[PDB]
Write a protein that binds this ligand. Structure first.
Ligand code: DHK
Length: 501
């Protein structure tokens, strides 16, 4: 619906002087406007302070004076709260946000008294879930019925599938609509506003100034997700997983997409149920997906067609939705990714029997013997007796035969479990090379103690980048820009302890 989405910065400093500085920071970061959350001011002298903000703000101002009954910090007299909003309007505010509950009354009190460049946003906040399209429409009509210039509906994501309903609302409602879904599971709704008609999205001045759950930073929206490039036709891709907030796939793919001018955007996809997810996002808009724990094997089953190597391995980490029939094709780039990294580093002990374990184990047999150690024995057992290998009780891993190579394919060691390692340091001696598929952190405890053991270490980054540029080729149909990916990872994927949520 209409213009690309604006980016609004929430201003919550508890002091007016601090808010003035934040509005300047908002402009520096690239925001289009700022939402002044008046309910967060410790001391507030309405007439004097509003004037100061409107006068000093380098960006258009949106004033909100959120009450405790609507999830804000304001308590006290309702008429006084409204007086402030009317005051903001008559002092030159670009917008004010008024709760649907009192919208009609408010709008009637300023009828014929609204300045020229002024818009009233009427908002509704749902903290429990995301209602049906039926209920959402009723909500939109009610808000429009108040006389609102702009409709704002904030819901909560119980499941990622919920977002699709909000996109349908912003995409089809014939009235300026700010539609967002709160929570990590609703993050995608804050990122794709420009593709689906959203009037604006909120981005934080920094990762610690959140006014609502799931809000990304302005810097990430603009530089990580390439917000300004997202349009009605951009194809959407994403990393399916749980957890998924540590994934750096959105970093590399968005950089690569931008570099080669491919019209696509890549986001994080926190998926609880793979089947419901795929069904909720089956349109052509969603062209491809990357899969990590714990949806690699399930992805194999969900794919209409499966590549020989994938079907052979028993796990899929790459899903491509073919334009033709529109079906799902499954591929596996983990095998070549990890195996290649290991050979480059140069009997294989594979920790973990999940999709990554299958892929690595499989690839390995295709070239010495391989033992599959896994806590859940049944899993390691099934795998072991598939690639013609031996299983092993995880507890017995600390003992073993020398010059062997160790390959962890489990999440052990991944942030925030930075002091966790799948094997005792004293047992690393029996290994020549140690590989860790975990790449966040780059240097896990396993790899660190492995190096202190004189063994050669192959970081997860080596495998991650490799499997990533192969996915780029699958998603785009363009030659894998290998050198580019290494450069992107090095320049944009080196910070640790990052969580996108
Ligand atoms: O984004 C990640 O963390 C990814 C991690 C690995 O499991 C790859 O197989 C995925 O394709 C991408």
């Amino acid at each position: 619906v209409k213009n690309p989405s604006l980016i609004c910065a929430p201003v919550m400093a508890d002091s007016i002087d601090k808010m003035v500085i934040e509005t300047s920071k908002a402009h520096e970061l690239g925001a289009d406007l700022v939402e002044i959350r008046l309910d967060w001011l410790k001391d507030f002298n309405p007439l004097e302070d509003l004037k100061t903000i409107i006068k000093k703000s380098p960006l258009p101002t949106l004033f909100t004076y959120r009450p405790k009954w609507e999830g804000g910090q304001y308590e006290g007299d309702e008429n006084e709260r409204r007086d402030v909003l009317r005051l903001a309007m008559e002092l030159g505010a670009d917008y004010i946000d008024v709760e649907l509950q009192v919208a009609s009354e408010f709008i009637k009190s300023i009828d014929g008294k609204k300045p020229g460049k002024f818009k009233v946003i009427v908002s509704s906040h749902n903290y429990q879930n995301t209602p049906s399209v039926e209920d959402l429409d009723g909500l939109v009509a009610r808000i429009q019925q108040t006389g609102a210039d702009i409709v704002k509906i904030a819901t909560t994501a119980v499941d990622i599938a919920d977002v699709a309903r909000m996109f349908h609302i912003t995409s089809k409602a014939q009235v300026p609509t700010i539609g967002l879904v709160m929570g990590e599971r609703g993050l995608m709704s804050r990122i794709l506003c420009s593709k689906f008609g959203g009037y604006l999205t909120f981005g934080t001045l920094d990762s610690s100034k959140v006014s609502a759950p799931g809000q990304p930073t302005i810097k990430d929206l603009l530089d990580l997700y390439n917000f300004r490039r997202i349009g009605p036709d951009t194809k959407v891709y994403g990393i399916i997983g749980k957890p998924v907030s540590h994934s750096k796939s959105p970093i590399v793919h968005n950089q690569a997409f931008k570099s080669v001018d491919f019209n696509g955007v890549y986001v994080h996809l926190l998926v609880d149920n793979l089947v419901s997810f795929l069904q909720a996002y089956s349109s052509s808009d969603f062209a491809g997906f990357s899969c990590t724990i714990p949806h690699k094997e399930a992805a194999l089953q969900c794919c209409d067609e499966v590549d020989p190597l994938a079907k052979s391995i028993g796990a899929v980490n790459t899903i491509l939705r073919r334009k033709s029939d529109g079906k799902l094709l499954g591929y596996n780039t983990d095998c070549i990714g990890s195996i290649s990294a290991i050979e480059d580093g140069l009997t294989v002990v594979v920790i973990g029997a999940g999709g990554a374990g299958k892929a690595l184990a499989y690839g390995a047999k295709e070239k010495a013997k391989v033992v599959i150690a896994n806590r859940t024995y049944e899993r390691a057992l099934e795998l072991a007796e598939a690639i013609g290998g031996k299983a092993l009780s995880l507890t017995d891993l600390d003992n073993y035969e020398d010059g062997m190579v160790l390959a962890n394919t489990t999440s052990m060691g991944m942030q925030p479990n930075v002091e966790e390692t799948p094997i005792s340091k004293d047992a690393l001696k029996h290994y020549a090379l140690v590989f860790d598929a975990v790449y966040t952190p780059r240097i896990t405890r396993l790899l660190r103690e492995a190096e202190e053991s004189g063994a050669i270490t192959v970081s997860g980054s080596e495998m991650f980048v490799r499997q990533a540029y192969e996915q780029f080729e699958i998603f785009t149909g363009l030659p894998a820009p290998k050198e580019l990916y290494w450069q992107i990872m090095s320049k944009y994927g080196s910070r640790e302890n990052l969580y996108f949520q």
